[PDB]
Design a binder for this molecule. Structure first.
Ligand code: 4C0
Length: 145
């Protein structure tokens, strides 16, 4: 299996699933290193973020837990095809990159917070993370290139 990925047993059905402890992705299907990646993301900030302010809200007061529920609800909508990533990033991301449908452009190792960077380099082009926590808040990361 590629970096980060482990096979596991689903507790509900008895079916195998796969999860990645670097990107927090999980999926039923069996899955599948670059110098640079291009990613977009959707940031949800909370009262404990480094800077609890954004273009959406002068004071961010939701808890970390409320931020995690928001993130989980956006992943559900993206995975079901109810909304696409770019639409939710534009409308709801607490990063100013929202204005570019979450696009951060291309970057190499040694530029972004570690947990964001590790998750980005562990995705393959096209794949999306689960909830990735950094000091900024909670992220959904889409690797575009
Ligand atoms: O650092 C920025 C701006 C980054 C950016 C890059 C390219 C285009 C637009 C913004 N904003 C932060 C929120 C934040 N924290 C991050 C950590 C990793 C990646 C993206 C992040 N975004 C904040 O406002 O606290």
């Amino acid at each position: 299996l590629p970096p980060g990925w482990e096979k596991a047993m689903s507790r509900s059905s008895g079916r195998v699933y796969y999860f990645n402890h670097i990107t927090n992705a999980s999926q039923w299907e069996r899955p599948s290193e670059p110098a640079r990646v291009r990613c977009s993301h959707l940031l949800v900030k909370h009262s404990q973020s480094r800077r609890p302010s954004s273009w959406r809200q002068e004071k961010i007061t939701r808890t970390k837990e409320e931020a995690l529920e928001l993130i989980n609800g956006y992943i559900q909508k993206i995975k079901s095809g109810e909304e696409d990533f770019e639409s939710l990033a534009s409308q709801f991301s607490d990063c100013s990159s929202a204005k570019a449908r979450g696009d951060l452009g291309a970057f190499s190792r040694g530029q972004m917070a570690k947990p964001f960077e590790d998750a980005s380099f562990a995705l393959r082009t096209g794949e999306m993370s689960g909830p990735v926590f950094t000091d900024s808040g909670i992220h959904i990361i889409l690797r575009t290139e």
